Chain length 156, copies 4
Amino acid sequence: TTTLENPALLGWFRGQQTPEGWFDLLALIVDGMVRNVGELESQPFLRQMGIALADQYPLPASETVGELEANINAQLARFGWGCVEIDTSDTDLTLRHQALPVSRVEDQQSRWCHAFCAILEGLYVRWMQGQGGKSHVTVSRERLFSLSDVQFRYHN
Amino acid sequence: TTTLENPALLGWFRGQQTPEGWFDLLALIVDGMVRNVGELESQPFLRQMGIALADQYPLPASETVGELEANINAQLARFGWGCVEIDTSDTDLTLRHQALPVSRVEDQQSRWCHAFCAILEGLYVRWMQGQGGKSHVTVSRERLFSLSDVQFRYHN
Amino acid sequence: TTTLENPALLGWFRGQQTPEGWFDLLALIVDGMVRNVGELESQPFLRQMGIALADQYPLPASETVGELEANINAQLARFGWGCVEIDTSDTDLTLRHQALPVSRVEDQQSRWCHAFCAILEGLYVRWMQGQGGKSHVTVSRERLFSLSDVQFRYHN
Amino acid sequence: TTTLENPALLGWFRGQQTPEGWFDLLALIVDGMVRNVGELESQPFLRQMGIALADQYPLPASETVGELEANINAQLARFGWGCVEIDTSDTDLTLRHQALPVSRVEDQQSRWCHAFCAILEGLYVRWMQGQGGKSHVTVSRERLFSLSDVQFRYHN
């Protein structure tokens, strides 16, 4: 019942989500690389980076979608990146990610968001491969609700 | 626009608000003392402790209510206790405190809330005397909306 | 090769050991209570509080002294209170606690140290009882090296 | 006084110095970029990145070398990157940086260190420009103590 209509509370929450120092340097590195190389051709390489991240922190075996959601939520809370929820459709899966991190500089924010989204793709794929998913099965974007909310579609 | 209808997000937020270890020991000490002495009989003494805390961290002088609100919000965010907002009436002031810390054990939580409210009173008094307030002018609790929302009244 | 001969490094380490806000309030409460009641008279009651804390965070079963040391070290690292090492004699055990937390105010600090030691006693006892230790065993101090180094002696 | 001869204490200290998640991703990005491009021709670009970082957080005016050391130490402690000390020679300045961050992967760690060093260079330059120094003056390495200690020479 405790909302964030007061700007001070949301400001404190967003500031505590991303601690000082490291995040600014990471944003600067990513923005410099994407400006120097380009938008589209940088999509694959970044994805590979995400895959490597999933090699660092494997998850235990899961038998139901609820348990997988619990493990993913626990790991994301450990990272302090936000939260995600799972939904099942007639044939495909949907992941709703909320409370997306926001850079302090407003002008570059948009670009930054796109870059960050790409990374998540790679990571998510390997986690879904934890149950034995095939290597050629991937995920792609479908829509962007706002600057701090995204949804992903998983299909075989 | 990022609400907390998902229990995972609010759980992570509340867990990050109060880090492990120190908060549990503080809650145990306060609960033991209040059980040994009593809710009313310990109300004055606790107040004094709050005043002592305000001696540690003075605030700079302010000329407007908005500036005082800004300073109080900055200090509270530094403590990571939540947020408060000021409202002015024809004769009295009102403080609205949101996102009150909640103990992990739900059984004692009610009692805990009351205890916490008491100490806040004392602290607020000293800060209000930062602008030249008299010693004999105090504040008193008037109503409790829920387990995580309080309001104080400043009057002569 | 990472020494603390430079005061700034040790200052930052000690400041990050005890996060802002909660620790000052806890120190104020403990100091007020011990001044009101007395150093010896408050020694037993505090111990009981420690016991309650050990009920919150149980440890898994241990078979060797090294494994138990690993569990205790992991829990203390989770608390961020410092480190402890175990030594075994012909009949009794010794626990050396290093990097004890230090209050910001130098004048009261000595008193604070004593109080803190008392709490640890209770906690340690229940953890030692985790393998089936009986109630009649006790833990007592023997000597204090300095303001940030303690040693406890356990005998049957 | 309180040494770190016990590996557990230094392990906890290093683990707290770099929180989980962000640091691993930053290390992965830097390592991938340097592998893709090369160590030497990647030296200039990284430097410029550091300059950009110094654009974010200007320092207040300082009149003495000790005051500048105090400001730099305060900012570094705010970042939680370690500590640095200033020494003056017959014609040039020397900066001794201690407790350098260390990556969790031991194999790549050495490479990481070199990369990190480059960034610091650029940053330091702009901070030395805070006292009206011209842009043409730079800093360079002279020798490396170990994996967690470095020294820089500032000459005109």
